[PDB]
Amino acid sequence: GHMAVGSTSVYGDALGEVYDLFYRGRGKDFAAEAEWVRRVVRERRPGARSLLDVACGTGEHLAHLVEHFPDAAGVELSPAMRAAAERKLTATPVHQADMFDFDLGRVFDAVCCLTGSIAYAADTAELARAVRAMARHLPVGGVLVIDPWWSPGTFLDGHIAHDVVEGEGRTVVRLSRSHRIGDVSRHEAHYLAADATGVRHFSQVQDLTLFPAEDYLAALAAAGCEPEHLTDVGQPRRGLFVGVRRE
Amino acid sequence: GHMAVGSTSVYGDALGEVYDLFYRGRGKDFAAEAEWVRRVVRERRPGARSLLDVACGTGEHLAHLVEHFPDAAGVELSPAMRAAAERKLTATPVHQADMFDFDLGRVFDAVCCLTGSIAYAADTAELARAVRAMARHLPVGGVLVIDPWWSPGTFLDGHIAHDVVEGEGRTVVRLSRSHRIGDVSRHEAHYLAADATGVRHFSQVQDLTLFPAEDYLAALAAAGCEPEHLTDVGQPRRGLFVGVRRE
Amino acid sequence: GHMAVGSTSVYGDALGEVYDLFYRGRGKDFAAEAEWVRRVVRERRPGARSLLDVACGTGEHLAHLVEHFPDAAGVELSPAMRAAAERKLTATPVHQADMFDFDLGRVFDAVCCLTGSIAYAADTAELARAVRAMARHLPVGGVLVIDPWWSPGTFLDGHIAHDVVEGEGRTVVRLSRSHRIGDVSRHEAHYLAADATGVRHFSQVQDLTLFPAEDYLAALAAAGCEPEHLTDVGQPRRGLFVGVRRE
Amino acid sequence: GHMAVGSTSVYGDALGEVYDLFYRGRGKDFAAEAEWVRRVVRERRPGARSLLDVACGTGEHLAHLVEHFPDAAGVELSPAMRAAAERKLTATPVHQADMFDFDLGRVFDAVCCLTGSIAYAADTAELARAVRAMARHLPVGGVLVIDPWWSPGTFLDGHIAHDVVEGEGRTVVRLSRSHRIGDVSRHEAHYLAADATGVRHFSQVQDLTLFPAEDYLAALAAAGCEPEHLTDVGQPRRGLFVGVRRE
Numbered sequence: 007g008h009m010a011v012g013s014t015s016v017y018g019d020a021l022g023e024v025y026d027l028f029y030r031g032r033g034k035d036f037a038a039e040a041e042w043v044r045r046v047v048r049e050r051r052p053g054a055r056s057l058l059d060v061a062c063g064t065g066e067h068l069a070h071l072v073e074h075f076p077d078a079a080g081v082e083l084s085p086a087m088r089a090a091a092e093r094k095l096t097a098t099p100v101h102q103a104d105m106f107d108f109d110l111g112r113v114f115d116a117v118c119c120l121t122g123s124i125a126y127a128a129d130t131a132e133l134a135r136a137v138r139a140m141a142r143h144l145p146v147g148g149v150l151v152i153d154p155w156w157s158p159g160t161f162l163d164g165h166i167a168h169d170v171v172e173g174e175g176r177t178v179v180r181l182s183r184s185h186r187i188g189d190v191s192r193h194e195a196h197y198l199a200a201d202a203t204g205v206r207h208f209s210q211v212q213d214l215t216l217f218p219a220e221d222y223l224a225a226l227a228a229a230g231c232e233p234e235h236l237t238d239v240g241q242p243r244r245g246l247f248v249g250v251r252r253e
Numbered sequence: 254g255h256m257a258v259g260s261t262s263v264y265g266d267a268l269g270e271v272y273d274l275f276y277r278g279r280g281k282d283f284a285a286e287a288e289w290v291r292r293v294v295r296e297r298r299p300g301a302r303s304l305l306d307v308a309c310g311t312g313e314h315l316a317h318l319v320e321h322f323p324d325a326a327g328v329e330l331s332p333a334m335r336a337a338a339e340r341k342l343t344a345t346p347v348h349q350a351d352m353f354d355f356d357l358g359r360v361f362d363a364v365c366c367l368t369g370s371i372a373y374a375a376d377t378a379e380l381a382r383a384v385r386a387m388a389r390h391l392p393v394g395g396v397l398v399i400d401p402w403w404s405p406g407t408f409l410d411g412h413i414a415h416d417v418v419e420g421e422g423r424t425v426v427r428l429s430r431s432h433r434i435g436d437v438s439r440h441e442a443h444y445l446a447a448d449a450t451g452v453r454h455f456s457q458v459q460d461l462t463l464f465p466a467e468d469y470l471a472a473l474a475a476a477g478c479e480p481e482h483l484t485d486v487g488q489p490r491r492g493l494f495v496g497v498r499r500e
Numbered sequence: 501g502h503m504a505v506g507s508t509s510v511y512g513d514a515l516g517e518v519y520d521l522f523y524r525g526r527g528k529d530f531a532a533e534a535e536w537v538r539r540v541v542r543e544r545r546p547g548a549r550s551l552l553d554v555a556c557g558t559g560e561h562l563a564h565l566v567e568h569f570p571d572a573a574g575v576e577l578s579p580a581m582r583a584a585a586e587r588k589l590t591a592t593p594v595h596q597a598d599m600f601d602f603d604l605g606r607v608f609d610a611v612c613c614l615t616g617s618i619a620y621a622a623d624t625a626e627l628a629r630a631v632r633a634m635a636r637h638l639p640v641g642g643v644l645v646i647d648p649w650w651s652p653g654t655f656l657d658g659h660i661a662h663d664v665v666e667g668e669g670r671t672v673v674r675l676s677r678s679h680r681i682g683d684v685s686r687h688e689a690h691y692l693a694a695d696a697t698g699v700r701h702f703s704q705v706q707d708l709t710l711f712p713a714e715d716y717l718a719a720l721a722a723a724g725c726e727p728e729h730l731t732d733v734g735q736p737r738r739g740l741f742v743g744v745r746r747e
Numbered sequence: 748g749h750m751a752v753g754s755t756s757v758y759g760d761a762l763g764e765v766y767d768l769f770y771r772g773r774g775k776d777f778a779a780e781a782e783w784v785r786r787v788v789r790e791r792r793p794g795a796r797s798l799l800d801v802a803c804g805t806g807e808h809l810a811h812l813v814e815h816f817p818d819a820a821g822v823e824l825s826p827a828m829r830a831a832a833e834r835k836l837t838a839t840p841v842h843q844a845d846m847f848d849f850d851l852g853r854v855f856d857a858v859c860c861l862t863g864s865i866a867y868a869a870d871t872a873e874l875a876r877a878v879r880a881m882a883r884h885l886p887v888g889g890v891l892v893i894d895p896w897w898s899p900g901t902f903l904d905g906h907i908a909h910d911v912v913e914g915e916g917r918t919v920v921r922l923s924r925s926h927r928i929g930d931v932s933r934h935e936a937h938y939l940a941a942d943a944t945g946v947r948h949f950s951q952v953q954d955l956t957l958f959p960a961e962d963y964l965a966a967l968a969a970a971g972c973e974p975e976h977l978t979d980v981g982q983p984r985r986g987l988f989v990g991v992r993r994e
């Protein structure tokens with residue numbers, strides 16, 4: 007007889023999601039990036055052994071860093087990410103908190119915020135608040151490492167990417183697109199998945215602010231750190247912003 | 254900071270669903286329809302006390318009929334519907350089975366299939382199979398009552414309907430549309446719901462066959478029942494098809 | 501034979517749309533709101549005869565205001581809205597421009613921005629830029645009227661609304677929901693429409709900033725206007741912010 | 748300022764579509780399949796020079812066949828396909844008609860229906876009608892070639908496929924899934940496309956009937972053709988059904 011077909015769609019706000027972050031992570035060199043942090047910190051703070059990673063996602067960078075920085079922690083707003091990070095690490099707490107205003111009641115030799123995550127900040131004032139909150143988790147001589155998002159100058163229009171993962175009984179395809187709006191880059195990601203249970207379609211739209219170099223350096227100085235822009239680490243044409251907390 | 258937005262959509266086959274059937278049921282006169290069945294059965298079988306309702310949905314017609322037909326049962330393919338019907342009734346079994354070929358190992362004084370449900374049959378042969386399976390659950394003198402779907406002649410193009418249910422902290426709206434394809438009516442139903450958890454969109458597309466009067470009467474005769482078409486019960490311009498099982 | 505079913509979905513950025521604004525407008529008292537503007541302007545500027553409406557949408561408020569302010573204009577970023585407004589008005593130009601930084605090369609006795617449209621501004625600095633751009637289209641003694649969006653204090657969580665319009669051969673239903681995120685209200689609107697051509701589903705998600713009273717008054721003062729908050733016009737519990745441009 | 752995001756979705760019935768058929772066609776060996784037809788026809792009808800391809804899609808098989816069968820035609824129900832086929836061919840008419848009941852007022856040395864297209868027939872009676880309509884476009888000695896869809900025995904559960912086409916400024920990904928329902932295979936195809944205009948999602952669900960070998964052979968015999976099943980041409984484990992029209 008005739009058999010109906012159906013769909014259900016649910017819509018809402020989104021934060022870090024396990025599989026999404028797994029999936030994005032596939033061609034990503036967590037090792038190289040952890041190395042940037044280790045190197046820039048140890049140059050400025052040779053004995054550094056404690057580290058906080060702010061908006062740490064799945065905790066994968068921490069899994070690299072902890073060999074060098076055995077007294078480590080994470081901060082993640084997404085309950086799902088926080089639980090997945092904590093599962094993956096050993097005796098490394100991951101705290102559920104807002105990068106924009108958090109306080110853990112301790113300091114660390116280094117604080118990092120990686121892969122442009124700081125550009126969830128919507129404006130310069132909010133950027134400054136995040137960098138301040140990071141800086142108060144440092145002692146004098148502590149190192150603050152920001153892997154910035156793109157600037158208005160360096161953001162490239164026209165980006166489109168896809169990926170495919172074909173497993174046993176399950177295939178997932180991904181397509182993504184980005185475009186500029188004012189001083190925001192808007193990122194669209196769509197997934198289709200198919201297995202024995204059926205087909206699913208997932209989508210997410212997220213904005214990141216395009217801050218010029220001056221705004222990052224400024225945020226560092228206002229947070230009581232001596233600001234550097236380093237171009238021999240980080241991604242080409244963006245580099246890293248580093249601050250050493252001043253007495 | 255910036256907060257992403259997201260959607261997840263899942264696609265699959267659909268059978269009877271609790272809320273959907275609740276919702277459809279709102280202006281529906283279960284009482285009037287149960288009365289058609291009671292009346293047509295008692296005219297032909299004055300002592301009738303047992304009844305089987307095939308594709309019984311939520312079991313609401315059975316809840317009316319059981320006062321008159323205290324030894325009752327249902328058949329429902331949808332596990333969700335079967336469980337909801339059984340919950341609503343007292344000591345009335347609802348069996349998970351296919352109306353097209355089922356066998357319960359007993360007979361009943363009457364068998365019904367209501368609200369056009371028989372027109373899930375895709376063709377005349379399948380219609381005949383359903384009516385046969387119904388007819389073998391009757392003794393000699395048993396009454397088979399079919400509330401047919403529309404025929405090619407009587408189906409009306411242009412149907413569009415909507416409903417709204419506005420509760421405390423939750424609103425659901427529904428919009429539906431139907432159109433003819435060959436000898437099939439295709440029914441589209443969309444829902445939007447919104448509460449504190451967010452917004453959801455649901456959709457379903459289902460076909461029903463448009464059988465002419467002759468095909469229903471034929472199915473009855475081939476199932477060993479004496480066929481009637483009754484026009485003073487059932488919906489205007491379609492009536493009911495009734496069969497009395499013959500020795 | 502079997503006939504496939506299908507969907508196509510397109511995703512993108514959205515500005516003012518004709519039918520959407522028609523639809524929203526249905527219970528809206530354009531007359532009352534135009535009256536607020538007329539009254540507050542004529543109290544402060546008895547001879548006022550020219551008016552600019554910034555983010556004017558369909559131009560419906562202008563259609564009321566022009567009897568009183570016969571030398572009028574609009575500003576609208578959405579090409580569709582701009583064309584629809586201009587169609588509806590007589591000899592009233594509607595300019596395609598950004599409310600945040602526009603210059604028409606003239607002044608007007610009054611400038612307004614209605615129904616919370618100013619709260620497309622993402623932060624206080626951007627609010628100040630819009631109000632400045634408005635204020636430079638005023639002479640000394642000119643009146644700037646802002647119908648603000650809600651403040652953090654006055655925004656009400658839990659809003660859900662629906663509408664239905666049932667025409668000949670066409671029905672449109674609408675469902676909307678809003679919630680607070682930080683100092684942003686996020687507004688979701690879904691439509692279903694059905695006619696002889698089929699069924700369509702439309703959705704939009706839009707943010708507005710929740711600015712406290714001080715931020716609006718501040719923006720006025722920094723734009724060289726003497727700031728008032730008026731509570732006997734505008735919506736209950738929000739009022740209007742008015743500025744008189746100072747020499 | 749804040750910029751809304753939006754989606755529009757339209758739902759309806761679907762027939763052959765140009766890009767979809769392009770896309771499906773990518774790993775398809777039109778040449779091999781045209782060769783099956785040529786070979787089976789010329790074995791039985793050495794002088795054969797005229798051919799009709801029923802449900803011809805884009806006309807690509809015809810573009811191969813016409814070298815051998817220069818007096819050719821197509822039948823296609825989809826206006827879009829019919830126009831695209833006719834564009835691609837030279838002086839080969841493609842008629843808009845229903846494969847289930849059409850009459851072109853001539854015969855051809857051969858009639859084919861390829862890539863399982865005949866299994867749009869919903870039941871045996873409809874299959875027989877299509878094969879009859881094909882057979883009356885043949886003279887005595889004419890060859891009818893059917894590339895059948897899968898049978899209940901040979902249909903394989905678990906099929907999932909994907910494709911990707913990455914062009915300059917445009918990427919399209921495709922994911923498909925099939926499953927069995929009663930004697931129907933249900934096919935779901937989803938596409939995501941992204942270019943400078945945005946992202947689009949397309950989906951289609953289509954049923955094909957699973958007929959056993961006997962039903963195809965039967966249809967041939969009832970259409971006045973001598974039936975063969977050939978296993979050294981066509982796809983492995985399904986072969987071709989061929990009929991020679993009898994005096």
Ligand SMILES: Nc1ncnc2c1ncn2[C@@H]1O[C@H](CSCC[C@H](N)C(=O)O)[C@@H](O)[C@H]1O
Binds near residue numbers: 064081103105106126
């Ligand atoms: N306000 C906030 N505070 C803390 N974490 C946040 C946040 N807003 C977003 N995030 C998190 O930031 C992460 C960005 S995804 C990438 C995370 C990681 N640094 C990496 O390089 O792999 C998400 O996991 C999201 O949950």
Ligand SMILES: Nc1ncnc2c1ncn2[C@@H]1O[C@H](CSCC[C@H](N)C(=O)O)[C@@H](O)[C@H]1O
Binds near residue numbers: 269329366
């Ligand atoms: N093959 C099958 N066998 C049994 N029930 C079926 C079926 N195909 C569909 N149905 C059921 O038929 C019902 C149609 S909805 C209406 C049911 C009920 N007779 C009424 O009048 O209210 C659905 O609950 C669905 O689950």
Ligand SMILES: Nc1ncnc2c1ncn2[C@@H]1O[C@H](CSCC[C@H](N)C(=O)O)[C@@H](O)[C@H]1O
Binds near residue numbers: 516556
């Ligand atoms: N940056 C910008 N500049 C000008 N208009 C804008 C804008 N951003 C959004 N808008 C417009 O602002 C309008 C908000 S809708 C309501 C408009 C109208 N004032 C009313 O009360 O009816 C939309 O038409 C949208 O196109």
Ligand SMILES: Nc1ncnc2c1ncn2[C@@H]1O[C@H](CSCC[C@H](N)C(=O)O)[C@@H](O)[C@H]1O
Binds near residue numbers: 764803804808824862
């Ligand atoms: N009833 C009908 N009559 C004619 N064509 C039909 C039809 N139902 C579906 N079709 C067409 O059948 C085609 C199936 S797609 C494949 C077509 C082609 N034989 C090939 O091998 O490439 C579609 O183009 C669709 O438009």
Ligand SMILES: Cc1cn([C@H]2C[C@H](O)[C@@H](CO)O2)c(=O)[nH]c1=O
Binds near residue numbers: 160162191243
């Ligand atoms: C290399 C590079 C990538 N990208 C961006 C565009 C995409 O949105 C994103 C893909 O990782 O990276 C730039 O914006 N600039 C660059 O120089």
Ligand SMILES: Cc1cn([C@H]2C[C@H](O)[C@@H](CO)O2)c(=O)[nH]c1=O
Binds near residue numbers: 408410431438489490
């Ligand atoms: C009254 C009536 C309703 N309908 C149909 C059209 C819709 O698909 C459905 C709504 O219940 O009923 C007919 O087809 N014919 C009729 O005579």
Ligand SMILES: Cc1cn([C@H]2C[C@H](O)[C@@H](CO)O2)c(=O)[nH]c1=O
Binds near residue numbers: 736
């Ligand atoms: C009356 C009133 C409406 N609303 C809002 C909630 C909804 O998002 C919107 C509906 O017009 O108005 C407030 O936020 N506060 C109020 O006092």
Ligand SMILES: Cc1cn([C@H]2C[C@H](O)[C@@H](CO)O2)c(=O)[nH]c1=O
Binds near residue numbers: 903
């Ligand atoms: C080879 C083969 C493919 N397939 C089907 C499953 C998929 O729905 C479809 C992919 O072309 O082909 C079979 O059903 N049986 C077979 O033997």
